[PDB]
Amino acid sequence: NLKIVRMDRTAGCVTGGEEIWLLCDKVQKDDIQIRFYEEEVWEGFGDFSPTDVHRQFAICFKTPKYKDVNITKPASVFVQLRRKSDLETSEPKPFLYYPE
Amino acid sequence: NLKIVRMDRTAGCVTGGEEIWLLCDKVQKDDIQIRFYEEEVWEGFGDFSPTDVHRQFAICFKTPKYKDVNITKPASVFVQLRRKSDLETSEPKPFLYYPE
């Protein structure tokens, strides 16, 4: 039911706060989150409000800060949509965090 | 009726071919174009297919090449949505072309 169709950026700086857009199948603006995660499980969430959800089919958000801003080489993580209500998730997409 | 709500990039190289996303009010995928223009009237069109229109509310496209790839300083142009059928347009957005 949940699907990341495309993202306009699939990497970003460990410091976070960088704007990325994603296209999705239909979501409810008040029942959607964007979860970045890494199994070692680290998670971080995209920073957006319901007003940043465009007509239920796209989301503009800012990346979370990665767990370690002092990494030396890129850190490969995953991103998924997740419903807040029932925790249902999309298939994950790879995302690369890189050093500042 | 037509509206560019946001664009993920508002500048690009004169050489064109660079991917930009825009969020729009509802369009028909087979009756929509993205027109870059400059009153001196130069026009160029975003390069996309109907499959690049996401659920009628966003469009992923590639910029057109600007009229002069040998400019020295940035060239300010406008971008609008336009319906192919009746040529109705959105309000324009500013776009900056820059030298290679």
What experiment produced this structure? X-ray
Measured CA to CA, the distance from residue A94 to residue A76 in angstroms comes to 7
CA-nearest residue to A9 within chain B is B8
- The residue type found at B20 is I
Q: Is residue B21 less than 8 Å (CB to CB) from chain A? A: yes
By three-state DSSP, how is residue B74 classified? coil
Q: Is residue A84 less than 8 Å (CB to CB) from chain B? A: no
- Count CB atoms within 10 A of the CB of residue B8: 17
A49: Cβ–Cβ under 8 A, 6 or more apart, which residues?
none
Measured CA to CA, the distance from residue A56 to residue A12 in angstroms comes to 24
Q: Which of A84, A67, A89, A85 is nearest to A76 (CA)?
A: A67
Measured CA to CA, the distance from residue B34 to residue B77 in angstroms comes to 13
What string of DSSP letters covers A20-82?
A: EEEEES---TTS-EEEEEE---EEEE-B--GGGEETTTEEEEEPPPPS-TT-SS-EEEEEEEE
Measured CA to CA, the distance from residue B11 to residue B47 in angstroms comes to 16
Contact A54 B26 (CB under 8 A): no
Q: Which of B67, B55, B8, B5 is nearest to B27 (CA)?
A: B55
CA-nearest residue to B60 within chain A is A8
Contact A57 B60 (CB under 8 A): no
Phi and psi angles of residue B60, each rounded to the nearest 5 degrees, phi first: -105, 130
Task: For chain B, count helices (H), then strands (E).
Answer: 0, 9
CA distance A28 to chain B (A): 15
Q: Which domains does chain A show, CATH number per domain?
A: 1-100 (2.60.40.10)
Measured CA to CA, the distance from residue B27 to residue B59 in angstroms comes to 9
Q: At what resolution in Å was this solved?
A: 1.9
